[model samples]
Target: SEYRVDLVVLSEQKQNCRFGLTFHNLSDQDLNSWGLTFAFDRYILPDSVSNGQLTQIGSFCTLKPEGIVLAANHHYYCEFSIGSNPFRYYSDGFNEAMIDFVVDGQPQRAQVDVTPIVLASPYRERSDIPASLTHAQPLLPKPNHIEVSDHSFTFDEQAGVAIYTDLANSAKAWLLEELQRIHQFTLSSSNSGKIIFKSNPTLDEGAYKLKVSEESIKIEAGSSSGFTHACATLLQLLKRDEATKTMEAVCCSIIDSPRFRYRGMMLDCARHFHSVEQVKRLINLLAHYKLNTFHWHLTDDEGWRVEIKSLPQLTEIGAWRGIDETIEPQYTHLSQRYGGFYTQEEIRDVIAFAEQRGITIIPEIDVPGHCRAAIKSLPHLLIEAEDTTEYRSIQHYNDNVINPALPGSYEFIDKVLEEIAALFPAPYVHIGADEVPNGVWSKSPACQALMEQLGYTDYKELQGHFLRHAEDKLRKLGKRMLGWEEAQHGNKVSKDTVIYSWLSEEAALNCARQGFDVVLQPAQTTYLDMTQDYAPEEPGVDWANPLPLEKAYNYEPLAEVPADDPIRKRIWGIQTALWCEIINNPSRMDYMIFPRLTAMAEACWTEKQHRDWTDYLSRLKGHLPLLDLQGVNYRKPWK
Candidate 1:
């Protein structure tokens, strides 16, 4: 009744890894004409099979021996090497595969147990674990102005708030929630207490001033994100006394405002689906770092991660994948069905959750370029049957880009963008106008006719045509268009379309010079999916150079541009992307983000002259334990 499969790494050379898979038949009878179905999430070189032949479709691979028999309780082993070896992360191994065989002239399919990821090499233990310090520089994103005195204040469990202004209501609620979630204690609400919140309308939108003393504490802010920022500062200031059942804050004063209006973090939920709870918790972390934007990447070639009521097929077929499913496996190999979409209710809940923390949730439905999920779901509507375009994308997709010549193309754009505009209230909607592969729409009969009718010469212009239509649609929906740097390709989208400069700072400068507002997110510094260091055991991708914490902290956006350059006016803010291709779990997400996210937050919040890496690291070392208390599986800083 049991089938066991064990995998051993025979050899590993970075991306080229050879492994021996042993299949043990644990049942009581001999098995005949058996075929093993498993996925490696990597390519298996043809003709490398020892006794069996491998047939692969993407990451899904099946092996069948020409003529082999296995006795009762016998073992069959074969060596087939496959690598992406990731050569790093342990997410590559696929388990829960199926075994098909004939027993007593009856065909049978049974579950095969896969051995968990086993490493035959050295591994580095987690490092840079920070210890709790009683007193140190008490801020995460280095407060703009802070002065601490010797006096202190003790916040008891029964503490109450005196709210002088309605703006303080959010801060008050957040203070109570923060204490309960992190500190495991709560405070009561009353009209009068030592904890006080007052309004200061003259301050900047996100600006806040906090004061702590022996008798009482006072928070003053403009209250859009200001009140929440004040509460965040207060939470950072107070370290708990677990035994005493109280929290103490040294007397200090902080005056702070974000240097850039748009400090953001993008979490790609398409490649790897994080649960609603996980997204909500991460939103709390972003708010703690004073980041104002949460970019939610919801679609890609791999999967579409949001539900559109108008387009049920987008989620019905696009939101899931398995060997038997309509959509094939992608990013990583998995035999079991995997992927999920955020329903309208879940999307609204997350938006509200982020709003409470003074953070805006921006949803990205990557278009035309990364539309395999949607296209596959509604091939009748999205695909032109006669269009035989030939192209391969960075992700090896030939049919992912949407063709602008088709009637369904307009239907998909107008319908999806309209639903996106209505669902979450963020003023901006990111239509990912990036990575539309070359040669698309070039050979399509419909596309050629459309281009001839429009007098456009190049295939790239087709992308521009689609983006322009999207822009017009968004404008009509009363939402601004935000896109990756490629959104401007073919000169279609205008200066009104904000560009996220991810390719490089030079691209950012070009976008600025082009009169488009740019969000500085050069992947070298902002793509947190890149490994933290050169350590062989680190768990991240390194296509971009490995981002040591110092390198991330050292990113200076547009350092080459003159401070007084007129083009500098187009600089909107800074953002970091936590693209979740390799980051599949919450713990891995925490490992890649913490300390580095803190660094990116500082990069966006702190001014250039004010940021000193050594000083920031010193403060971060003291702040580590707080992450621990919150159960964050953060990577320790390297020495």
Candidate 2:
């Protein structure tokens, strides 16, 4: 069936863009009862649906006829108008329209064929986004010290690496693998190698020095991380020219070290499942960019994405969700069982791979809150039957928080955290003590009894009790406890609890002042899950302001505290997170991560004095070829 849906302008007032919609039914049968679904990218007046009823959820909208009918080849007309937000582009109109009707006592649905949207006149054009400029500099994360000479070195079988220490051996293998995998050029040991790797004991762990003179190329580092960073810098220094068909390395001397000890990024795989290959691919990016940490958010309200051998139900039931499963679906394809999990073996292999690349893979098992998957899977253990507190979580689920009063909750945390600790060898583990709803544990008899017995009136104290117990369990397993800023609410957890501050930088400063290690992750500046620009069409959330590349690059961690202050010494490092609510596929993930992630990477490795916007942009343009060669589906910097 074809339809001529015209939203003709009726009148333009100071308040609204008054328009009339005429949807013609050109089907073979009469339209007895019908509804249309579309996405309104711009705001629309709900009450202004003068002739029809409608429902709007976020960007999605549905229109239904109240008591109107249309025979074959007839027109059903209605009037409506735009809301406060005027159209910016002509394309800012209802899209993805689908028609549903009762056909011969059966419900039928079909997509509307290409209805042109006629917006109010004077909308701007959505075209010609200029690319970001590049500088003449060849390296990213510009080294702390660099001096370029008037010479160039070429790579061939004659230019081979010589290594004896394990650091150089691993760095050499990485260079060879990346060269072939990304550049399709292999370095073979066909001659006496001149490129030398020397272990310098006096240098810092993450410090490296490189010399790329014409005669010989020398590399020096004291730690594996330094070696990897050195190699990554060398890889960036190589200029690839498709026209010349040869790679040339610039002759220079570079002495570099990290600005922060811990540079990390968290990928939330629980909201939407990512394949092992996809996870590994991101792990490769973190490694190549010299990011030292990968925080794997494996559990959340939506899905449990790791296998717990002791608690089989975590994977058996919580790993898959639909309307009838243990955990009902919230986002993405509600009709389908959309979820997955990683086996212990797969987790172990990825940990080893990350370790080889100088990255510590920290596993996160979100506790107390964001455990809807676990609560549903093991209701007998995690849920309280008498608890009808009726408090909804941030994601709008009432059953998402765990009943900390129950022994089963502790048992669940113990078993799950044990398995996670065994799989991931990183000393620091993330136990998400974040976003426990406003009135959780208020109505439970077990919670009341425990509170009365422990002399605790506030629920935050009760939550603190549970978190401290989990902290003790992690301590027994030889792991340090890490949690979000909310972990400090009850003031019970020891100062040993590493606080990942997401709400704001002031929260990080507060945590540091309290004698706790603080990892700065202020969402406004570092969250990659936020939209790239102010454009509503961008595929990301917007609660945190649109995080463009320049904004991500320009941030000073702990700037309030003096460099010599003792509280400044408590700064653990920095981490950026890509929460997977809006990210379902690799393409969307790459679109949000890259560009901004590179900005964060440079901030982490380069000294503050050397970090300038103009120089960085110039260096960033040079990385496009490397990103392309590595098959990174990255969005270019904002226009």
| lDDT (C-alpha, whole model) for all candidates | 0.81, 0.78
What is the C-alpha local distance difference test score of candidate 2?
0.78
Question: Each prediction's TM-score against the native?
Answer: 0.87, 0.84
- In the predicted model 2, the residue pairs found to clash are 134-618, 135-618
Number of clashing residue pairs in every model?
A: 0, 2
> What lDDT score is found at residue 224 in candidate 1?
59
Which parts of model 2 are misplaced by more than 4 Å? 1-136, 189-191, 241-246
Q: What RMSD does each model have against the real structure?
A: 3.7, 5.0
* Candidate 1: residue 528 lDDT (0-100): 91
What is the model-wide C-alpha lDDT for candidate 1? 0.81
- Top of the candidates by TM-score: 1
Across 6-52, the per-residue lDDT of candidate 1 in tens digits comes to 87777877667777888898988877988888755456767677878
Candidate 2 residue lDDT tens string, 1-639: 475466556676665677677778888788767876664534457788887887753344668887546788888778877643343332344544667788778977666653555545542323223455764445766788998888987756446778756777777778788888887776754335767888998889889999988867889999888999998888888776665545677788888888888899999998889999999989988877789899999998778989998999998999997545766554454445678899998988898888777889988988888887888789778777888787756555567788878999888899888877777888988899986889888888999999989999787688888888989999999999999898876675789999899888777787788889989888898899876665445666655566767678787676556657777678878898998765789988998998788888877777777878877777778787778777788887644
